[PDB]
Structures are given as structure tokens and as C-alpha cells.
Amino acid sequence: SGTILIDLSPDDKEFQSVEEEMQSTVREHRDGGHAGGIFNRYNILKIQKVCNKKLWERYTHRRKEVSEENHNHANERMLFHGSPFVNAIIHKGFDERHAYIGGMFGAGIYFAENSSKSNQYVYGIGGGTGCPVHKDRSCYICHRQLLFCRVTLGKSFLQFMAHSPPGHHSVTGRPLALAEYVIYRGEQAYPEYLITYQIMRPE
Ligand SMILES: CCOc1ccc(-c2nnc([C@H]3C[C@H](NC(=O)c4ccc5cnccc5n4)C3)n2-c2ccccc2F)nc1
Ligand SMILES: [Zn+2]
């Protein structure tokens, strides 16, 4: 593995930006915290820059080729990613071959602009079985990990499917409607930050 993790100081403006974006993008969900638990804040334990030359080259190469297909704009966004595979993604990069064959928008890799949305997928689809220790989707004890990723959306197809529709590079969903984003190529996302956190008990 060529992956290096740069621990960021909490007083670092880079840490604070990722910290603020995580806290500020929390929303009240329609499922009442069934999937991701009950909280309005996080305990931010650690934020690490993910450095991997091979993975960066894979991303920038795809970003250029999506750019030339989409009027010389990549449509690059910073989005959150939750999945039980974070530990794999930071070493191997995103891999569409492991996508959930049955999903709202087919076998793609899902991102959110709301940290609390990505939180719902950390322990599986709809929080799966919860934390491995307590089997609790609302565990305040167990440490969770999100990625904050550079994602190339390109020309995004709006939907309310194996690959992007023709002429398109991604899908934007809006099923309290919140925006999800799907790609069908792992090279269209770079996992830039690894965020280790807990959900905070309110009171
Ligand atoms: C609204 C429908 O609900 C959702 C929400 C999120 C996702 C999703 N998005 N991304 C994923 C993960 C699969 C994909 N896997 C990898 O990138 C990856 C990368 C390297 C891997 C190495 N070894 C084993 C597995 C590996 N997996 C990220 N998943 C995902 C896939 C399977 C199970 C849970 C998931 F969150 N799928 C459906
Ligand atoms: Zn737990």
C-alpha cells in the first residue's frame, strides 16, 4: 500500500474547515435516526489527510477526461461517503465492482452533501446491524469513520441502471428531500480526508 495518513491538528484551519462542514451539514432525517442514530452534533476525534500518489493520478486522469466530455468543466464537489469499506477505500481506492447491485440508483458508489446522510450507511444499508460491539445503530460509544471526498460529477443525470446514462458521468437523486450523488467508476472520487468520530448524545 502507498497510502500515507497525515494527522491534522485541531487548531489547523484545514481541520476546522472539515470539522465545520461535518457539524454544519447535520439535518433532522425522516427515519427519526433509525438508520444513523439520534444526535444533532458529533464528537470529532481525528481528521487525517489521505495521501496516495497512485490514487491521485487515477482521479486527476479521469477528472481531465470527464472535463473534455463536459464543456471543459469537471463539476468537482467535496462530498461525504459512508460505507462499511472505508478501511479498504483508503488503501485500494473506490471500486464500483463492490457496489450494491440493487439500489435506488443501481450499482454505483453513493455520496451526500449532508454528513448525517452518509452516517446512515457507515454500518451498512439503513445502518445495517448497528455497531459490531453493541448491535446499536444509535451507539454513542463506538467510533465511526466517514470519508470527505473530492468527487468528479461531470454532467449529472437528475432522477427522482449499471452505468451513467449516455452523455452523463454521474446521477443526482432527491428522494425532507436531501441530495444524494452516485458514480459508476471508482476513479471519479478521491478519499481526501478520513474522519474518525462518534455521534453525540443530546442532553
Ligand atoms: C440509497 C441506496 O443505499 C446505498 C447507500 C450507499 C451505497 C454504497 N455506496 N458506496 C458503497 C460502497 C461499495 C463501494 N466499495 C468500495 O469502494 C470498495 C473499495 C475497495 C474494496 C476492497 N475490498 C472489499 C470491498 C471494497 N469496496 C463503496 N455502498 C455500499 C455498498 C454495499 C453495502 C453498503 C454500502 F454503503 N450503496 C447503497
Ligand atoms: Zn457500539
Swiss-Prot record:
Highly expressed in placenta, skeletal muscle, liver, brain, kidney, heart, thymus, spinal cord, lung, peripheral blood leukocytes, pancreas, lymph nodes, spleen, prostate, testis, ovary, small intestine, colon, mammary gland, breast and breast carcinoma, and in common-type meningioma. Highly expressed in fetal liver, heart and brain. Ubiquitinated at 'Lys-48' and 'Lys-63' by RNF146 when auto-poly-ADP-ribosylated; this leads to degradation. Deubiquitinated by USP25; leading to stabilization. Changing residue 104 to V: Loss of activity. Zn(2+) binds at residues 131, 134, 139, 142. Residues 9-203 form the PARP catalytic domain. It is found in: Cytoplasm; Golgi apparatus membrane; Nucleus; Chromosome, Telomere. It comes from the Eukaryota. Oligomerizes and associates with TNKS. Interacts with the cytoplasmic domain of LNPEP/Otase in SLC2A4/GLUT4-vesicles. Binds to the N-terminus of Grb14 and TRF1 with its ankyrin repeat region. Interacts with HIF1AN. Interacts with RNF146; this interaction leads to ubiquitination and proteasomal degradation. Interacts with NUMA1. Belongs to the ARTD/PARP family. Poly-ADP-ribosyltransferase involved in various processes such as Wnt signaling pathway, telomere length and vesicle trafficking. Acts as an activator of the Wnt signaling pathway by mediating poly-ADP-ribosylation of AXIN1 and AXIN2, 2 key components of the beta-catenin destruction complex: poly-ADP-ribosylated target proteins are recognized by RNF146, which mediates their ubiquitination and subsequent degradation. Also mediates poly-ADP-ribosylation of BLZF1 and CASC3, followed by recruitment of RNF146 and subsequent ubiquitination. This is Poly [ADP-ribose] polymerase tankyrase-2. The lineage of its organism: Eukaryota, Metazoa, Chordata, Craniata, Vertebrata.
